[PDB]
Amino acid sequence: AKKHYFIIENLCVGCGLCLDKCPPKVNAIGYKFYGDVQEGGFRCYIDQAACISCSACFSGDECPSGALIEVLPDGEVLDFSYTPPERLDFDLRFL
Amino acid sequence: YQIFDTEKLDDEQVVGGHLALLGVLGFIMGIYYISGIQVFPWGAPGFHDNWFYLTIKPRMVSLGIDTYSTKTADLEAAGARLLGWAAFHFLVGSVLIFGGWRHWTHNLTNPFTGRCGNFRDFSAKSYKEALGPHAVYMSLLFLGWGIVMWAILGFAPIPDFQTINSETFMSFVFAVIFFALGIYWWNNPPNAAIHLNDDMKAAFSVHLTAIGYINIALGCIAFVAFQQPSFAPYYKELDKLVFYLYGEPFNRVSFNFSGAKEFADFPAYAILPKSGEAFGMARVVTNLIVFNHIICGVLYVFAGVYHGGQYLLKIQLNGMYNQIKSIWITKGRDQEVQVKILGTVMALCFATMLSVYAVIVWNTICELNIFGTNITMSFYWLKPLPIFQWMFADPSINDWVMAHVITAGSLFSLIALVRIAFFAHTSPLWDDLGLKKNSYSFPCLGPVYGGTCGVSIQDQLWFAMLWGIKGLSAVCWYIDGAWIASMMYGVPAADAKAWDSIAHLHHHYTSGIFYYFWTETVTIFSSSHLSTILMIGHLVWFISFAVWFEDRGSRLEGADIQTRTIRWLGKKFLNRDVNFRFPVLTISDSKLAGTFLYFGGTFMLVFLFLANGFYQTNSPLPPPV
Amino acid sequence: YQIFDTEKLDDEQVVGGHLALLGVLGFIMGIYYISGIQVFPWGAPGFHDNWFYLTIKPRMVSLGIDTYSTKTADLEAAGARLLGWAAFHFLVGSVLIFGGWRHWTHNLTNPFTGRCGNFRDFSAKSYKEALGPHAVYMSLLFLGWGIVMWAILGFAPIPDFQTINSETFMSFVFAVIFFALGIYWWNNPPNAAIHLNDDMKAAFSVHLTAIGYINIALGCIAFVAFQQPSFAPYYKELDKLVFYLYGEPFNRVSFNFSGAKEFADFPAYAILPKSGEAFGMARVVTNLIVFNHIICGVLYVFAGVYHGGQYLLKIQLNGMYNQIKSIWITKGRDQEVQVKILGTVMALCFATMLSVYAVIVWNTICELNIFGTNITMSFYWLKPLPIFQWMFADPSINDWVMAHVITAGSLFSLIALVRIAFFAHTSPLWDDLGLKKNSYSFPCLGPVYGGTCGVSIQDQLWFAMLWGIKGLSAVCWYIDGAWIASMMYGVPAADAKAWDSIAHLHHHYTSGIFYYFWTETVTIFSSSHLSTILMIGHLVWFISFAVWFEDRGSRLEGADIQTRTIRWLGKKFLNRDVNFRFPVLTISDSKLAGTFLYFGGTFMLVFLFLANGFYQTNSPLPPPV
Numbered sequence A: 001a002k003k004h005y006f007i008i009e010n011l012c013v014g015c016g017l018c019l020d021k022c023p024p025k026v027n028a029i030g031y032k033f034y035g036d037v038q039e040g041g042f043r044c045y046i047d048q049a050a051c052i053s054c055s056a057c058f059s060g061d062e063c064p065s066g067a068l069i070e071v072l073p074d075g076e077v078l079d080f081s082y083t084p085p086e087r088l089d090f091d092l093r094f095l
Numbered sequence B, C: 001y002q003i004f005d006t007e008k009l010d011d012e013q014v015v016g017g018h019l020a021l022l023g024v025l026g027f028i029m030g031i032y033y034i035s036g037i038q039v040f041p042w043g044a045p046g047f048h049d050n051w052f053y054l055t056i057k058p059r060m061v062s063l064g065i066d067t068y069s070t071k072t073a074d075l076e077a078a079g080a081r082l083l084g085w086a087a088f089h090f091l092v093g094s095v096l097i098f099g100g101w102r103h104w105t106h107n108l109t110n111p112f113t114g115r116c117g118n119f120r121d122f123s124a125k126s127y128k129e130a131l132g133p134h135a136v137y138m139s140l141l142f143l144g145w146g147i148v149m150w151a152i153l154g155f156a157p158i159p160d161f162q163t164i165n166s167e168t169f170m171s172f173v174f175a176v177i178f179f180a181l182g183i184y185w186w187n188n189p190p191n192a193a194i195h196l197n198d199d200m201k202a203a204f205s206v207h208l209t210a211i212g213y214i215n216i217a218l219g220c221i222a223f224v225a226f227q228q229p230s231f232a233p234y235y236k237e238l239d240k241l242v243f244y245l246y247g248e249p250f251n252r253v254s255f256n257f258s259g260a261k262e263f264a265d266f267p268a269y270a271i272l273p274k275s276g277e278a279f280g281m282a283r284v285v286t287n288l289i290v291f292n293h294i295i296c297g298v299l300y301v302f303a304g305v306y307h308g309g310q311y312l313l314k315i316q317l318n319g320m321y322n323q324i325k326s327i328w329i330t331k332g333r334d335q336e337v338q339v340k341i342l343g344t345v346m347a348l349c350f351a352t353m354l355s356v357y358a359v360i361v362w363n364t365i366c367e368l369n370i371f372g373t374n375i376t377m378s379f380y381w382l383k384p385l386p387i388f389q390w391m392f393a394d395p396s397i398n399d400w401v402m403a404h405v406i407t408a409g410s411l412f413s414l415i416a417l418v419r420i421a422f423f424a425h426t427s428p429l430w431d432d433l434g435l436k437k438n439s440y441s442f443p444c445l446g447p448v449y450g451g452t453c454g455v456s457i458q459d460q461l462w463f464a465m466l467w468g469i470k471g472l473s474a475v476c477w478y479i480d481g482a483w484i485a486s487m488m489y490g491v492p493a494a495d496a497k498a499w500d501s502i503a504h505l506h507h508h509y510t511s512g513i514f515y516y517f518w519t520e521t522v523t524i525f526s527s528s529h530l531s532t533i534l535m536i537g538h539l540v541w542f543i544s545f546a547v548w549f550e551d552r553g554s555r556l557e558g559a560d561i562q563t564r565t566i567r568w569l570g571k572k573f574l575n576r577d578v579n580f581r582f583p584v585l586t587i588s589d590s591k592l593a594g595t596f597l598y599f600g601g602t603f604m605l606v607f608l609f610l611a612n613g614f615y616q617t618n619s620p621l622p623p624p625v
């Protein structure tokens, strides 16, 4: 359906937590090695011809690198299902 | 194992579960009471001594329930009193469990009158308004205990701090202050405001960690108190008694059963009488009581910090972590104090244990005369300062190393606890890269950057427990008189039997750290019961390696291969009898299961060090010249 | 640690390195020879006994070089002969190292004549054409040894298989057959064709694994041979000698140095004489020799299989794995024989150790009379079959468990070896999903599917070594007479003091499996040297846990935090003296380093079991009635 999910290549670390939640009838998530898997050479990816937009991949809040995005149906791009409100800070000392 | 997690329960179910648990406690205490019966008032030669009742016998003898004698009237009266108290405990426990039923299911209705009851008013809305009336509630418990002693057990309240009448006097003094403190908090609640919102995880974690230090305090208080002349009638009257335990070396029987057995004792397979004054029973019971509260106290501390992290992580995921005024949060929400605070604790931990470990090996080197050295070259002169020599009896070098091993052991575990407290969501390295922690239980992130194992806060809890073994075990050696000052002692090799005289020890310790194992197990091997505990403890412990090594994927290999053998073997030997497909624990379960086998296995064996005798002499061990 | 990897060397550098290593071996053998000197021919009271020379002394005494006597002429002649042989070894080793230089740098040129030399012809192109002339080369080594004995050491070749003259006779008999076998292979090379293409990894791995079984064979042959009446003049003439070792309990000295020390012995700090017949020295040396070849033999086997996997993986990555007609490949290139073969070996391993472990606990239960049982209820009657009772002296139950523990131990390690052999690139589960193995050393793949730790073939090698400890350690107990039949024995608890009586053992073993540790260490604690080895071995071993647990990411945390403390501490205590940034081992290095600390630490301690005495009596230990 709408709102595809689109794992980012350059940020992925290959932890594989994204791959767990995808239903076994849908093997939409896979691996790519192209090198030695100790300096980050087994990044995963999503197959768009099998994905059925479960949101199990995004709504689970598991990606630690922000590699899952879940682009919105019209044009919008997400990175995590909710973000804190970005305040700004200092130091205090009660005299 | 998360069926009773805090975010799923409301407030009443906590009260119901607590009442039910109190009832269960009453049942088991009554069970202990009738486990300590000797004669059965109708006359039915009862039970033999077991470690559960021998732990509480001094308290009963102090309260005038049990006694230290073997006569007609004494045992008959003691059994009757114990039966009465056990029945009373059973009755109150049944009532309490019924009340637990009543509070668990939201059903506060009177059985006699068709009345109801609202948990809101009957009062308090938040937990700070509840702190107040609780102090009034506890003032009643102190008041009742003073009444129970005075009315039933005698012991009129008298301020004499050498006999138990002072305890009755104190319970009335405390009821004054807890009541007076109760009213003021009912009118002026105090304020650490964050504990009321997620009040069943945040406030719980603070209480659990606070209870942990309290248990350690009573652990140390009991050790000092029980060795006073005032406590003499109840603790080292144990020495001049004779004990019959279960698992004692029994009256052996030959194959002629004829059969010249044993000493002249009419029962065959009789339990031999064991003297309780060659056996250091007065100290053995004291060690058992003290160590139980110390290890339980430490464990509550680790749990209290761990659950604080579970809450602490949660408020950083939704967004409120930025949103606290409580100073208990702003003092560490900076990421430059955290490095300084963690830096200054990991360096002090470095400076301390390196100092003691240098002393311990140097003393060990000096005995064996390795590299051509004498014992005169050892630190046999490093006594504590004279202003600190009151807290020790016979101050010496053995006390100096102990006072620092505890510091070195404690701060070694504090590193993990701090890293739970601060780096629950982000660490300087994890924010150095672009990375998260999101589950407080994720095992790793993969082989990227060389490996990312055990970074979550649950793993940090495991290492605090594992590092805490060294600190906890150091207590077992010290309270059993083990001369932790050098790692060999009493060994007939070069100079170990010299410590005595060059240091004027005026006592005689059992052995060194290594030689601790060869000695002591003279008595462990003499008992068949203690021998089985030795074998079981070692079997459980090493199984931890099956789940603690980096092998979970390897075990996932064989499970697949196994499934096909029990699959191909029900094929042409027996007919179709097989559908079972082997499960392997996940990494998170592997560490949880591994830590319990490691921690459980080692401390079932520590029991043998304590519950096998004291065996500390007072002979200065003249020189081996 | 891959500086000398095989894919980087050509053929000559192997020959050069081998020649250099042979020269080094000659140097160290000469060093041993002069380490075994007693008197120094000019007269200079020499060295005391050490374990390196005492291992080879029987061989020298058999060859008429050393002797068992303390006189004037005997020691003077023995020292001279040893010096001569050491000098000869030094000379030949220097020549061999120079030849290693000559072959390592592609410089086969004569120094006298301006000649050159081609490694191709001077011959052979492939390794099967080289097998032939080597057998001719070895026929010369056998021929020379017969010449060296006959011409120099006497011992004319005589076929009497009770004295050493048979050895001289055999070396001439062997030179006949190796020469005759050499010509035929020079004309008819044999054919396992795949070993010639990648010939410095494939052929090497087969040889290394083949040498491993050879070493185990000579390990067992020596144990049987050295206990024959023919070998009596060289091995249990050791018993009626007196030995002076380094690290012996020395002449102690008081603080008066005056100083009434010791026995009447003129040297102060003198080494006490130790009788070699109360001390079971005749068997101690035999145990030391045998165990060295057994453990080295096993290790070569694991390495040979591991390097075969490195080759086996490589030919599956380029594509030639599909491309072999060697039957040694087609018998397992199917993925349905592999499951059947691995299935039938993991089930036999299941059926065997469960049988012995059931017997061992049942015997252990029966002694301690747990659950109301007698020793008559134990398996004190399960002797080996009468057709198998020739291979044992005094057949009993202790032999039955040993013969099966070896099988159970061996097949337990074979599981890892098979999984190296077959699942180097793909496994049924890894092909069940879509996945690879590509590096033979990758540590894991991440927490996906619950965890993927230790699936590579290097990790499988580690588990074979770790599982092989149980099989290897069972040999140490058995050859030292440890009664592995029950886990407690000689223990004065219930019935462990009997055993011999009800079984008619006709010997007396030291102890049980657990009680093995309490005994034996009576002598270990008596020696300061053995005591230090005990402490060092245990220190090295437990450090394996620092790198074997799932904690590499946790250690990567502190290294970052540490770097900032030594960074913030050179800031305001001392001035700018700090740029160092702490490295943590990767998971692959962590397992490599962990396995060495685990394997190295445990076997430095096994040396203490062997090199502390035999202590096996011959008293049937009358009943404890």
Ligand code: G2O
Binding pocket: B540, B542, B543, B544, B545, B546, B547, B549, B551, B554, B555, B556, B557, B558, B559, C346, C347, C349, C350, C351, C353, C354, C357, C412, C415, C463, C466
């Ligand atoms: C006594 C301790 C152990 C076993 C018993 C055993 C059994 C076992 N292990 Mg193990 N193991 C370690 C200890 C033990 N591993 C350690 C300390 C490490 C860390 C180094 C370790 C590591 C690995 C890796 C990495 C792998 C395995 C496997 C694998 C399986 C192989 C199948 C097999 O050989 O069949 C044969 C299996 C048997 C004959 C088992 C029968 C026993 C009888 C019932 C004895 C009773 C056991 C016990 C006393 C009762 C339990 C009571 C307790 C709960 C109070 C097989 C079940 C492998 C698989 O899982 O699949 C192949 C694998 O990959 N391991």
Ligand code: G2O
Binding pocket: B346, B347, B349, B350, B351, B353, B354, B357, B412, B415, B463, B466, C540, C542, C543, C544, C545, C546, C547, C549, C551, C554, C555, C556, C557, C558, C559
């Ligand atoms: C005696 C054995 C051990 C230490 C000594 C030690 C030292 C240490 N460990 Mg450890 N460790 C284990 C054993 C030892 N871990 C085990 C068995 C496990 C598995 C459960 C284990 C696991 C973790 C995890 C998971 C983490 C650490 C760390 C961490 C660092 C913390 C920094 C600190 O406390 O400063 C204080 C550090 C010291 C005072 C070290 C000074 C000692 C003096 C020189 C004694 C000499 C040591 C030795 C005798 C000489 C070596 C000779 C040998 C090669 C023949 C710190 C260097 C952590 C870090 O790496 O960074 C924070 C971390 O995350 N561990």
Ligand SMILES: [Ca+2]
Binding pocket: B480, B520, B608, B609, B610, B611, B612, B613, B614, B615
């Ligand atoms: Ca003790």
Ligand SMILES: [Ca+2]
Binding pocket: C480, C520, C608, C609, C610, C611, C612, C613, C614, C615
């Ligand atoms: Ca021995």
